[PDB]
RNA sequence: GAUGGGGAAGCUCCGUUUCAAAGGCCUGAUUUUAUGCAGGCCACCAUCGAAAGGGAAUCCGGUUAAGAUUCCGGAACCUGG
RNA sequence: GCUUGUGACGGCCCGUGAAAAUCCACAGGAAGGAAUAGUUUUCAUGCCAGGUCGUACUGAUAACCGCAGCAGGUCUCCAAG
RNA sequence: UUGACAUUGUGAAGAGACAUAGUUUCUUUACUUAUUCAAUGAAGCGGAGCUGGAAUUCAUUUUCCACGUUCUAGCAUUCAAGGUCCCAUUCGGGGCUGAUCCGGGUU
């Protein structure tokens, strides 16, 4: 028969079928459970004289937070665990390797009340 | 220039925010004349062909 | 002994070219079909200053003969070429200052810069300010051609080898005295780390053959043999003659 | 004719972007292609010795077709057939009880290089099919000698894989025949004779013809019209 | 400074787009369903290398024992969806 | 006036004084789109969203380097009469 | 650096013996396939023919050449319009031509 026609002088890699993985046996045997549930996210409250005076005039909820977790994971955790909507979350890494969340509860809720619920006064 | 309405990046003639009118003028005159003289020297060499 | 300066230059470190500001490598179009059988046109859309090269370059722009796009070329602007000018390149092309002709297509006495050695290498000879080559005759069968280079040497190269009509701009650049150290300083600022230069006779025998002595002096013949080895070659290497050139030179 | 125009186009150096063409003659193949090609080139540019190149003289479509016909009439047992035969003597012989000769004398093409060679030496094979594309050529180049020495008709057949087909293998260096059913018997000498016209009888005259040395066209054209001009003034 | 490679007994050395079969985007093809491929361009080829170079976008006021163009109050602006 | 910013110019060079990401525009016309209804999200208004890390203080005749709370050394901005 | 040997093959002219037949050995020069240099998104090579027509015809062609672009600092891209062949006619789509054949040695 006949050859082929090539409108270009550049032999490029013949596009080939990419077959995917069919593991004839497992990766791990059991998927690792959630490594950062909300119980791990927020670790302890922070009850400084200045941190309470944050909760007085601020409607703020200070927490010691897992340094593996970011703004989103702290919002979702505060919400789910303390039953609140959250306006914004400000964070910082205090000089001893711990995350200090400066959560601010939306206007609706009162952080003051929310303290003596969880139990620190 | 991406935070701003198109009328800030153009003037309403062809070749707006590109060339400067006075340039587009030459672009035109040079275009017409040369496409014209590109006929004069056709008919001319026609004559040289049909007669030599 | 120490290793002498002219040894440490070739490891190339502090010595390498001062390349940051250079416009690009100036060379002719690739030798293709357009230039092989006929001619092709271009606009010198700019002649500009290359740093560390006292002869201006000409940016010449072309159409690409295979895709719809512009190609830009960097030339060494010959003397007289101007912005806007058209440039023709290839076998059948006019004999005007600027165009590029296979050395065959020119008669005895044409003058051409950036001329190739082997054809196709995009240029190699008489590329400096003022420099040009002259054609002193062709050998039609065995299509060679013969030229007198800047250094008056009588070489023969292919007739299909290309050159560009005229001499190179910025001539007699070397007539104005540098006057002062700084002007030399700034000259080599954009060339290479070879200034200022210290005299070997002013250094120590560790540092040089000429190095050492209670009197400052070369201490032995400064004409060094070709077969000398690194560390040795300083002074007048392989000199077939030496001393003040009495008489009219030129080439025989 | 209506609102349409004929504008041709001028693809002639210095105008009009070139039209797509068939640059097949120019493409930059992968080196695995360059090396399998330039080998073929290098194979013939050199004067090749006449103990090789007595190959490259390969059988023709006609004669080979009937020689492939006659050989396909002698395939070896397929996997199934032998199982079929197996349980035809597993069932029998153990009950019917015949001295392993509850089975007919088999008739097939002999193969495997090492097998065939010993057969040629034992003067027992009658027709030898030597492949011509055995890449370590040294495997099979001594079989034209062996046959002519042992007085067996041989034939350098085109197709080492095709040779394999008629014997249930991907490939085979050689095909052979020691036996031929009484039917095909007389039919054999026809194909043997035809063969010995192009091979077994030529040999000695081909053993002294150094093959190859053949030029490629760009420098064959060079010579071709060089010995035309400077002679016919 | 990896990679194809070429050096080197070897630690490794050379080289950086270089004698390499080097990749991925529009979205259509679907109305078996979620992604094969139908066009088509592209050969653009690692990567690291500036807290003074380049550079999307925030200001005023108030406030702390110690923080702020980062909190609060007000008033904007940018980018992505 | 001082400092500082910007302009239009001018002197100088065998010195003629980086890149790249990125954003825009244009030439182009592949396409796609209405009369009972299409088009537009470079016009206005409207919704959501913006992770990670650094953020204290010293910067020196005591928080740095000089065995030290050493007459040394250590880049810089603001600058009243 | 300079010599020999290996990488190292292939022709032709001329010398070198058994001493004026060719196996073999070299001084001059050819060959390309090893080896070496160069450039390019390996792009238009080499061979043949269309036309053209200088050529001078010494049978009729014995040939050599050329075979898209040069006043202008414009524009040149959608496998290309034109031609024409098909689907069983859509809206869209392809073949051939346009763009001469032949050899796959990128040059």
Chain G, protein-covered positions (CB within 7 A)? 1, 9-11, 31-34, 37-48, 67-77, 79-83, 98-99, 103-107
Q: CB atoms < 10 A from the CB of D159, how many?
A: 20
**Both structure tokens of A30:** 């059991």
How far is Cα B39 from Cα B27, in angstroms, rounded to an integer? 19
Whether chain D lies against chain C with 3 or more Cβ pairs closer than 8 A is yes
A neighbour chains, 3+ CB pairs within 8 Å: D
Contact B32, B41 (CB under 8 A): no
**Coarse DSSP helix, strand, coil percentages of chain B, rounded to the nearest 5 percent:** 60, 0, 40
**Both structure tokens of B22:** 């006075």
Contact yes or no for A9 and D26 at CB 8 A: yes
Q: In what order do the strands lie in the sheet with C86-89?
A: C70-76, C57-63, C40-48, C86-89, C100-102, C162-165, C111-113, C133-139, C144-148, C154-158
Q: Which of A3, A7, A9 minimises the CB distance to D28?
A: A9
Method underlying the structure: X-ray
Planar angle of CA C175, C178, C181, nearest 5 degrees: 165
Ordered alpha helix ranges (H), A45-110: 49-58, 71-82
3-class SS string, chain D: CCCCCCCCCCCCCCCCCCCCCCHHHCCCCCHHHHHHHHHHHHHHHCEECCCCCCCCCCCCHHHHHHHHHHHHCCCCCCHHHHHHHHHHHHCCCCCCCCCCCCCCCCCCCEECHHHHHHHHHCCCCCEEEEECCCCCHHHCCCHHHHHHHHCCCEEEECCHHHHHHCCCCCCCCEEEECCCCHHHHHHHHHHHHHHHHHCCCCHHHHCCCCEECCCCHHHHHHHHCHHHHCCCC
Whether chain B lies against chain A with 3 or more Cβ pairs closer than 8 A is no
Distance from the C143 Cα atom to the nearest Cα atom in chain D, whole angstroms: 17
Contact yes or no for D23 and A4 at CB 8 A: no
Q: Which residue of D has its CA nearest to A7?
A: D22
**Backbone φ, ψ for residue C165 (5° rounding):** -55, 120
Which residue carries 């053949």 as its tokens? D214
Contact yes or no for C37 and D13 at CB 8 A: yes
Contact yes or no for D17 and C38 at CB 8 A: no
Contact yes or no for A7 and D23 at CB 8 A: yes
Nucleotide closest to A72 measured between CA and C1': F51
How far is Cα D29 from Cα D46, in angstroms, rounded to an integer? 24
Which residue carries 């067996």 as its tokens? D152
Chain A residues with at least one Cβ partner in D under 8 Å? 3-11
């Amino acid at each position: 028969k006949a050859l082929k026609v090539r409108t270009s002088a550049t032999f490029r890699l013949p596009k080939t079928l990419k077959l995917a993985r069919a593991p004839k046996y497992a990766s791990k045997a059991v998927p690792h459970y959630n490594r950062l549930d909300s119980y791990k996210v927020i670790e302890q409250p922070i009850t400084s004289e200045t941190a309470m005076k944050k909760v007085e005039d601020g409607n703020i909820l200070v927490f010691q937070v897992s340094m593996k977790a970011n703004k989103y994971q702290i919002k979702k955790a505060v919400k789910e665990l303390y039953e609140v909507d959250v306006l914004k979350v400000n964070t910082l890494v205090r000089p001893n390797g711990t995350k200090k969340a400066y959560v601010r509860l939306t206007a609706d809720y009162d952080a003051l009340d929310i303290a003596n619920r969880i139990g620190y006064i | 220039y991406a935070t701003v309405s198109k009328t800030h990046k153009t003037v309403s003639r062809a070749y707006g925010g590109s060339r400067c009118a006075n340039c587009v003028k030459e672009r035109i005159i040079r275009a017409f004349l040369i496409e014209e003289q590109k006929i004069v020297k056709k008919v001319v060499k026609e004559q040289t062909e049909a007669a030599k | 002994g120490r290793v002498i300066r002219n040894q440490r230059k070739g490891a190339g470190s502090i010595f390498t070219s001062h390349t940051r500001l250079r416009q690009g490598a100036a060379k002719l179009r690739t030798l293709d079909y357009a230039e092989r059988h006929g001619y092709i046109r271009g606009i010198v859309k700019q002649i500009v200053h290359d740093s560390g090269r006292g002869a201006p370059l000409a940016k010449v722009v072309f159409r690409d003969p295979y895709k719809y796009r512009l190609r830009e070329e960097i030339f060494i602007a010959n003397e007289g070429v101007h912005t806007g000018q058209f440039i023709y390149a290839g076998k059948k092309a006019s004999l005007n200052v600027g165009n590029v002709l296979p050395l065959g297509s020119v008669p005895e006495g044409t003058i051409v810069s950036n001329v190739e050695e082997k054809p196709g290498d995009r240029g190699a000879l008489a590329r400096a300010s003022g420099n040009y080559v002259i054609i002193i005759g062709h050998n039609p069968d065995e299509n060679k051609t013969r030229v007198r280079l800047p250094s008056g040497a009588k070489k023969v190269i292919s007739s299909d080898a290309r050159g560009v009509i005229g001499v190179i701009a910025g001539g007699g650049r070397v007539d104005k005295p540098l006057l002062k150290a700084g002007r030399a300083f700034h000259k080599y600022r954009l060339k290479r780390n070879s200034w200022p230069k210290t005299r070997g006779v002013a250094m120590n025998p560790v540092d040089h053959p000429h190095g050492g002595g209670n009197h400052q002096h070369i201490g032995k013949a400064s004409t060094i043999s070709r077969g000398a080895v690194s560390g040795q070659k300083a002074g007048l290497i392989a000199a077939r003659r030496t001393g003040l050139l009495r008489g009219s030179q030129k080439t025989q | 004719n209506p609102l349409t125009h004929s504008t041709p186009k001028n693809f002639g150096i210095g105008q009009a972007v070139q039209p797509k063409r068939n640059l097949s003659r120019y493409v930059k193949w992968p080196e695995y292609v360059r090396v399998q090609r330039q080998k073929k080139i290098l194979s013939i540019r050199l004067k090749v010795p006449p103990t090789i190149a007595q190959f490259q003289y390969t059988l023709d479509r006609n004669t080979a077709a009937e020689t492939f016909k006659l050989f396909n009439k002698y395939r070896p047992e397929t996997a199934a057939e032998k199982k079929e035969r197996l349980t035809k003597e597993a069932a029998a012989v153990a009950e019917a009880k015949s001295k392993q000769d509850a089975s007919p004398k088999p008739y097939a093409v002999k193969y495997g290089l090492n097998h065939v060679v010993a057969l040629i030496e034992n003067k027992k094979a009658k027709l030898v099919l030597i492949a011509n594309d055995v890449d370590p050529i040294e495997l099979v180049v001594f079989l034209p000698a062996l046959c002519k020495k042992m007085g067996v008709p041989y034939a350098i057949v085109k197709g080492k894989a095709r040779l394999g087909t008629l014997v249930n293998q991907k490939t085979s260096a050689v095909a052979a025949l020691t036996e031929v059913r009484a039917e095909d018997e007389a039919a054999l000498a026809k194909l043997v004779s035809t063969i010995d016209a192009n091979f077994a009888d030529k040999y000695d005259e081909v053993k002294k013809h150094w093959g190859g040395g053949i030029l490629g066209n760009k420098a064959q054209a060079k010579m071709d019209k060089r010995a035309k001009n400077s002679d016919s003034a």
